[PDB]
Design a protein around this ligand. Structure first.
Ligand SMILES: Nc1ncnc2c1ncn2[C@@H]1O[C@H](COP(=O)(O)OP(=O)(O)OP(=O)(O)O)[C@@H](O)[C@H]1O
Ligand SMILES: Nc1ncnc2c1ncn2[C@@H]1O[C@H](COP(=O)(O)OP(=O)(O)OP(=O)(O)O)[C@@H](O)[C@H]1O
Ligand SMILES: Nc1ncnc2c1ncn2[C@@H]1O[C@H](COP(=O)(O)OP(=O)(O)OP(=O)(O)O)[C@@H](O)[C@H]1O
Ligand SMILES: Nc1ncnc2c1ncn2[C@@H]1O[C@H](COP(=O)(O)OP(=O)(O)OP(=O)(O)O)[C@@H](O)[C@H]1O
Ligand SMILES: Nc1ncnc2c1ncn2[C@@H]1O[C@H](COP(=O)(O)OP(=O)(O)OP(=O)(O)O)[C@@H](O)[C@H]1O
Lengths: 362, 362, 362, 362, 362
DNA sequence: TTTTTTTT
């Protein structure tokens, strides 16, 4: 008897697991009889219940091995390797088409037979989101395409407006949608430059809590951030490759992704002010609060943060042909499901009632 | 014959140990004949006497082996792996339910037949805490709910007041109850980077003693804390994942825990102010001051500053329906024990005594 | 049977792959039968489909190995060794031939078997270059000469002027044609090392804007950039070898390479400019915006940024006799393939579109 | 045959050896034929001469081992592991009892058959110390009880006075008695981060000659100390765990020890002074000076610094009930030896000699 | 056949080598034919020619090994381990006794028939040194015992006098005789910590050329060092341990060693004058200058700097009883040699020449 | 290999 490292690796690939402890912990669960595995019986997690019986025999033999972390290290490296092969070979539009398939597979579960969530609330989110700004689903489709075509030095959108104006609210959902990362500008230039090292393979990025100096005219308590933007204006423009930090591995050089950054109106150089392809003002909108104070399940469940909310909004608005091609198979089968659950009058009722500043329902 | 590595791992699972030297040291103790083991006979540490007989046979072989630290390292990473799996897959509520079972177990010891402390002194403790604030037990129910829901931008509580107001005490009790960590931010901006790394995978965190600036006009010597947290809104808001590191380790990326901030009274900007949900004023009460000086076992056993006392307070005051369904059986047991162990009127009198600043007991 | 480590090492030098993760990922693909490999059938990536059938047998056995990552580390060390050998042995001419020898291959990709592009656009890009003066084609060749004919102080070109002077686009383009790296300055002197240590064992180095003082009459921010330059004699005029410290790290010593410094208009402590090949002063021109306004594709495809344009600038303007002996024949072939598209009247037609910034497809 | 790793571990255990090189060097001393060992015959060093004969056979085989440092590292791990296990599971009273056992063992060796130190000279130092403060022995027992109980916030004593006051003399004695480390707080505010790292697992700490502020009238050098202490009030309070750091070590977390602060007569802010239980002001004493000047053997053998001197004072002054039962057996035997050796007339005469400032002896 | 790791280690012991690379290089040379060895035949280095004969047999096999560097590591560990055992167990008298044995080994070679240097010239050194200060030979013996007895407070010596007054010449010879280190304390206080770090496990220290305030009154360039020393009482007094730091390493705890201080006539605080045992005035003496002009071979061979020069002086001037009993056998032989080598009258003529300012030899 | 250091 000896461990099949191949079967271990196949789980890691099918899981797309890329943490060595996470995989180690995960695989050890399979050593017991799936026949009475309460997790399986509960259909507790798909990462478990889909795989327990398949891997049982190997996991029992793995459970006794003396090499366990070394086994897992090779498996995790194949996953990172696959990511990087894709990362350089694939088209940006092609990448997106794979990301969507990931999210659809989750919705299969979320609203499955184990329909643990329920779509009523999520469409109310779509309504509330589609209340926030004009042509909402368009400007999504617009920024979506912008990030695919990646026109050099047309690469970033920006937002401004008071605290709680919702700009973070928009931003977070866009990031959950695409995948990507968010980072902090304002830390000192050493820590800064290491932090940039997270950008590897990220299709898209954001920065939060960014500061300029001197916003105190707007009463804004102020700080460094703008300085460290200006340091990276080639990253911004993506004009070039640039190097990216690591620990215990070489720093690696490549071109830098596009995206969005959080601001409110501190000072900022005009080489930035004139630079960017887009910006939007977030203005607070009281009737949202007066729905929200009722509809608080939205926040508890992070529905308004969900990228799945955005996808549902696009599935709601746009015609099937407007999406990338192969997904249109599944788009229709979701378009179907929307028709089945929702008449227009459902969403009509929802958004109207909401728009009056009432709680979500009557 | 050979050492079973599996048996060592199982002991680490059973103890939930995760320091290689603690594991190594403790496992070596088993090598003597458990038959005669003085520590067993004294019944001194359950981490030992519940396991010595079981592990004896394998501890003798471990005492010979040339690999000892390697065997221990595997087991510790197994426990850490388990933590990461749990962290990624339990509901916030289940984590707390697990944590509460651990405290109930320690209480079954502390007031078990071994009775290493007096349940009456511990209940005397609870009275002093209940006295400390308006609607104390309702206040605690609020805080647990807040930490469990973890609602975006509604994650932080601010204790403020004068010196010796008890705010640190209350934080330390809440901290132990949920099992957070404590963090300093009156620190240099560079090594600050490694400080926050502690907070990886914690349920809760607390920021101590956040020193303001211009404070010495008010006799409070100015310091970095406020000048520092004002650059960390991303972390507090918990709205998007943020990245964390440790020495010789690459960055994790996760949401930041909810938590508490403590200060003596300092000026706070609208920005940071907007990101706390509740703030609480504490003020000295000379009758409490006197009573501790009589009842000083409250300090010496640190009774007034343990989650055990808060857990007890919740048990006495809250309906069993307010507990998660899984644990409710043990709650009924302990409620019945306590309602049997103490009348209302003893508790009534304790409050009168403590309100009257005399030593607690008569 | 066993993995041939030799075969893996061949593929690294054939593909010139020099990342262990990429190498591992690429190579793992070959374990499926090339016979039916859809990537091969679709002929998407030569780095795949050229090699699959050869490596398939070895790849299957590799995919089974326990030791896979170390096989790849040795293979990547092989390529790193070759590069280090060449970087020491050859002359700047030979090295520059080896570039042009396969910027040639870029032509064979840019106009590769797909009908990869229409060279019209590329010379429209080249034509957009030559616009500060009709001298500029010489200045390319003259700069290239200064690089091979490197003499002390005959090292650094002061590329002087405000935004949108194109200087950075050009610097980036040369950093593709020749290679080299780009760098910053306005630092404390230790951090300036931790910056400049990037330059280890390289042949061409480029730099960005530097703070003088007192220039706020042209709104130029004062600072300590110029202050560091007065200290950098041992590098700037550079007659004698000097060390190349990265922070705490790789303290190489040699002659520091030549290249280009980019900065705005600023005052002149002549102590500095004395060390330079140049003081060449640039400004934007209004009509050039109105060209770009109407020639947008030449930015969109990065044609204007690519060093490829500089090859074809040189292929146009410089007579074949000026090129290195073995490429001259290929220069004829791209003077042929120039004339396979271009009369000088079309070149002039495009110049005279630009003469008032007419859309250059005219 | 083969090296017993177990025997090496036992030697490390019995010598309580912390250090891998010290262990290596020691063990190699045994490789030479036991019966001729001059170190044994000269009875030079019990750490050698007790063990040589037993370990001899394995030491010779160890001398051949190709693996020597690995064996020592494993052995040192078990000694380190023991300390960490004890640190968690011991009562603070038990720790102190163990520390006393070790000092009492050193006192056997000093005054035993080896005749190596003069019990009469040592007793003179107790007389000089019992003069140094009012009620001197009472202060020691209170300090011991203070440090055993470790009451939150009520954890630190402040020593104040001029130069040549004796305060660091007394602090050093209490530190050797208990075990612990001094610390210097006058450092730059970065290196505090590593300076405090020394506190890990200690039983006491001493902050040495904290520099305050102003006070050129006071004729005191200024420094960081006082204000920088206030920035660490948490570590005084000890109410909650803190995070501590050593070079190359990832952080470990503990309650910061109780201890002593020493300073000249600077001003102190009560934000800090609220955290001192008790304050002792020393005075210069002419008769002590003139006594010491004629009692130089006290200093020439460091008697009045040494922890053994304080232990001898407690044995003389304190009833046997004040000691923990385990050592009451040994305490009684030492009391017998002292009352055999001395008389109260003698001790009073010594104290009178100190009071008269003559040499202690007459 | 196998390599003897033992034979390598024995060589490392006897060379007292502690650099892994240096040990490696030396041993590899023995692989060449010992019987023909040119380095042996020319008697170039004793560390080679004494050993090549024995180790050649093993060196041949060493040259084939693949473990070469790890063999050297274990060898060098053995030397370092020996030094640790020594430092923690020898008496300071035994420590000195070893270093004299080492110096006498060197002298045995220098004044040999093939290893050769001029026993006549080196005695001109002692004549010159014995003129630099009255009762020179006794002063050395006094200083020596002072360093050995290391009595608290009685620990430190002050050298005072103008530039070019010989104080550092004499200090250097003492430091060579005793194996200490120099330290410079004119730094600003915060930087001193790594300076003081140098002292770890050293026998002596010399504080070089301390600058005071107010020197400009006498054109002495002024500086901090005086005030820094006044701030270091505990290091000087040497009564109690202090903690010392080296780069990357964690702290060491030890008595700060005894030593020497040198200065021009800066005004010395009364506080410092209490610290020093001994003040020596160094003054320019015009006759020594003219003697040096006429006998520069003293400078050219560095004779007057050498601890070997001082050791010769002690051997000439001090009774055999002054030396430690164990070394006296070598001393008597060296006395016998010098008794043969010089009449007293020839030596006395040299003194008369030195007093005459004439060249030492005639 | 980082970390510590460096410098702050
Ligand atoms: N348009 C809006 N009007 C009123 N409240 C809003 C609006 N958008 C968001 N909110 C409230 O603000 C909270 C925080 O939203 P968000 O973080 O996106 O705002 P923000 O403008 O980006 O804030 P900040 O600049 O402080 O980070 C939301 O959870 C919601 O309760
Ligand atoms: N209401 C009160 N009146 C007087 N003393 C109090 C009161 N509550 C607590 N104390 C005392 O305050 C001491 C310290 O409490 P705690 O550390 O929690 O206060 P704090 O305000 O957080 O202090 P700090 O500002 O020092 O951090 C307690 O040990 C208790 O003796
Ligand atoms: N002479 C010019 N007139 C107008 N626009 C120009 C000119 N040269 C370049 N541009 C355009 O200006 C934009 C920026 O070009 P580029 O970065 O090369 O200029 P730069 O002078 O080096 O700028 P910076 O100093 O801001 O880095 C590009 O879109 C480019 O096409
Ligand atoms: N009370 C005293 N009266 C007179 N001389 C004293 C007294 N205490 C100590 N001495 C003398 O002073 C020397 C140094 O004592 P010590 O180091 O404790 O002084 P200190 O001024 O209190 O020190 P620190 O400022 O470092 O705490 C002693 O060795 C002794 O010679
Ligand atoms: N006592 C002396 N009389 C005359 N010349 C002297 C005397 N001592 C030293 N010399 C001359 O001074 C030179 C330097 O001597 P040395 O370095 O010991 O002087 P120093 O005063 O201790 O110097 P520094 O203060 O610079 O360290 C010697 O090489 C010699 O030429």
């Amino acid at each position: 008897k000896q461990v099949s490292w191949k079967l271990v690796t196949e789980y890691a690939m099918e899981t797309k697991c890329d943490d060595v402890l996470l995989l180690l912990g995960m695989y050890l669960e399979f050593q017991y009889s799936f026949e009475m595995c309460l997790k399986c019986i509960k259909k507790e997690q798909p990462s478990h219940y889909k795989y327990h019986e398949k891997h049982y025999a190997n996991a029992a033999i793995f459970a006794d091995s003396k090499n366990q972390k070394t086994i897992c290290q090779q498996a995790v490296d194949t996953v990172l390797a696959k990511k990087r092969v894709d990362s350089l070979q694939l088209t940006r539009e092609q990448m997106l088409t794979n990301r969507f398939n990931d999210l659809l597979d989750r919705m299969d579960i979320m609203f499955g037979s184990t329909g643990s969530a329920d779509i009523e609330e999520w469409m109310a989110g779509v309504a509330w989101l589609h209340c926030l700004l004009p042509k909402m689903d368009s400007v999504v489709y617009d920024f979506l395409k912008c990030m695919v075509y990646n026109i050099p030095k047309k690469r970033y959108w920006l937002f401004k407006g008071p605290i709680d104006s919702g700009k973070t609210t928009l931003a977070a959902a866009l990031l959950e949608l695409c995948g990507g990362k968010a980072l902090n500008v304002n830390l000192p230039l050493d820590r800064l430059n290491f932090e940039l090292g997270v950008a590897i393979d990220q299709f898209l990025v954001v920065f939060e809590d960014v500061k300029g100096t001197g916003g105190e005219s707007r009463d804004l308590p102020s700080g460094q951030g703008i300085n460290n933007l200006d340091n990276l204006r080639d990253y911004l423009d993506g004009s070039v490759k640039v190097n990216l930090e690591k620990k215990h591995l070489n720093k690696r050089t490549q071109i830098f992704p596009p995206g969005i950054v959080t601001m409110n109106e501190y000072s900022v150089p005009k080489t930035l002010q004139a630079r960017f392809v887009k910006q939007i003002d977030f203005r607070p909108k009281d009737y949202l609060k007066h729905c929200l104070e009722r509809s608080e399940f939205l926040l508890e469940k992070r529905i308004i943060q969900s990228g799945i909310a955005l996808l549902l909004m696009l599935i709601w608005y746009r015609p099937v042909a407007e999406f990338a091609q192969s997904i249109q198979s599944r788009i229709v089968e979701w378009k179907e499901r929307l028709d089945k659950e929702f008449s227009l009058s459902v969403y009509q009722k929802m958004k109207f009632n909401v728009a009056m500043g009432i709680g979500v329902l009557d």
